[PDB]
Design a protein around this ligand. Structure first.
Ligand code: MYA
Ligand code: 9M2
Ligand code: MG
Length: 382
């Protein structure tokens, strides 16, 4: 079609053949000082997420108005402490927690965020931001408020000297650098079929389906244990080495590996394999993100775990992923979710995952390069 806003932006056109690598336009050496204008009656407010009352306003905005699945049955329900993990990693800036309030009532009705990240894209490493948590209240939809939040976070990032971004979305925009399908692995099929996340096969009874997805009570790989503070350097080494094989990846410092992987109950889990010699040789990780089961009288919340970064050097990836499913089931999850990026297609079908119904598209702002297969994408955003 045409894209009234995105056709104005430094991104390649949909259908554009890209053979080159580099910025769409130059670094700016004068940047707009004034904020963009919202519609009348709304104002900007930078949200101090260290204030418990303001963090709870953001939690309510997203709980009521954030991403739903393609059937409008489940809505993400990020916890307040999860939002602090995703929004205050090393190098976060207060002006990059960008809220929109109704002037009279003060109600929070919009948000968008940026966090810094060093990104490796083919043969270039650049300091970028990751854009996430763009949300407009349901009563304000389709009034072109989202382009104002996108231009305003772009301005605030340009003031800090950054001219590229990475972001994901379930919608097609000019122009995906990679396209990933999500898959799911049932852990509690009775509840998944009750809430109609899943359906009972015409060729399987409930008994048989419970048996098909049943898992061992403890993981198979010897020496698996939670990551501890003494493991931060070796997790950093393992991840850095492992990610070199992909074409779009983060470059994390040792402090960022501590932030993104050190376990926090009900937010992030990381388990390392420590061999007979005391050496850590592998790790698996997954984050906790429930979904509200919209308008349902009985079960209110779907407990979902999401595959994060999984690094294998001595344990087969298939066994590490089996370990992850066992652990998730022990921790009371209903479903484990994963995308088809990195080496994930080597295990999805073998471990009984089923393919979902939509795409998570990956995008770069102000960076032209060839698109890549899902197997070459090595970056996961919450
Ligand atoms: C150098 C620094 C650069 C930094 C910035 C880099 C770019 C960052 C970009 C943002 C990365 C976000 C990453 C995440 O957080 S992905 C998660 C996005 N959030 C949700 O899906 C939550 C539920 N939905 C909503 O809250 C609203 O429907 C949103 C806010 C998504 C759109 O609000 P609304 O439905 O009321 O629409 P509008 O009338 O105001 O605006 C319509 C225009 O908006 C374009 N649109 C729709 N959805 C998206 C989307 N997910 N990314 C980018 N553009 C989007 C659309 O094609 C149209 O443009 P054009 O077709 O006319 O051209
Ligand atoms: C369950 C369920 N609850 N909901 C609300 C959806 C979209 C599902 C389907 C599974 O979706 C997934 C399953 C995966 F294994 C990985 C990712 C997603 C997914 C899909 C669309 C998204 N849009 N914004 C984000 C947030 N962030 C990455 C920018 C999304 C995350
Ligand atoms: Mg709008």
């Amino acid at each position: 079609r045409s894209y009234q806003f995105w056709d104005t932006q430094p991104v390649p056109k949909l259908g554009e053949v890209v053979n080159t690598h580099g910025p769409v336009e130059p670094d700016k050496d004068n940047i707009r000082q004034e904020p963009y204008t919202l519609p009348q009656g709304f104002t900007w407010d930078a949200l101090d997420l260290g204030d418990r009352g303001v963090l709870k306003e953001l939690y309510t905005l997203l709980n009521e108005n954030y991403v739903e699945d393609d059937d409008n049955m489940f809505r993400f329900d990020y916890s307040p402490e999860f939002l602090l993990w995703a929004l205050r990693p090393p190098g976060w800036l207060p002006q990059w927690h960008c809220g929109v309030r109704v002037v009279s009532s003060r109600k929070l009705v919009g948000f968008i965020s940026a966090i810094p990240a060093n990104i490796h894209i083919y043969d270039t490493e650049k300091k970028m931001v990751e854009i996430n948590f763009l949300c407009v209240h349901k009563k304000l939809r389709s009034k072109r408020v989202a382009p104002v939040l996108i231009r305003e976070i772009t301005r605030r990032v340009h003031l800090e000297g950054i001219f590229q971004a990475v972001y994901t979305a379930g919608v097609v925009l000019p122009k995906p650098v990679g396209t990933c399908r999500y898959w799911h692995r049932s852990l509690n099929p009775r509840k998944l079929i009750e809430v109609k996340f899943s359906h009972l096969s015409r060729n399987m009874t409930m008994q048989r389906t419970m048996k098909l997805y049943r898992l061992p009570e403890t993981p198979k790989t010897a020496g698996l244990r939670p990551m501890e503070t003494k493991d931060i350097p070796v997790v950093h080494q393992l991840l850095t080495r492992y990610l070199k094989q992909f074409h779009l990846t983060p470059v994390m410092s040792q402090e960022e590996v501590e932030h993104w992987f050190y376990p926090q109950e009900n937010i992030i889990d990381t388990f390392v394999v420590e061999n007979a010699n005391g050496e850590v040789t592998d790790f698996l990780s997954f984050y906790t993100l429930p979904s509200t089961i919209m308008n349902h009288p009985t079960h209110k919340s779907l407990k979902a775990a999401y595959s994060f970064y999984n690094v294998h050097t001595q344990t087969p990836l298939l066994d590490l992923m089996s370990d992850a499913l066992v652990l998730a089931k022990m921790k009371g999850f209903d479903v484990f979710n994963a995308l088809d990026l990195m080496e994930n297609k080597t295990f999805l079908e073998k471990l009984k995952f089923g393919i979902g119904d939509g795409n998570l598209q990956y995008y770069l702002y102000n960076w032209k390069c060839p698109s890549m297969g899902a197997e070459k994408v090595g970056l996961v955003l919450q």
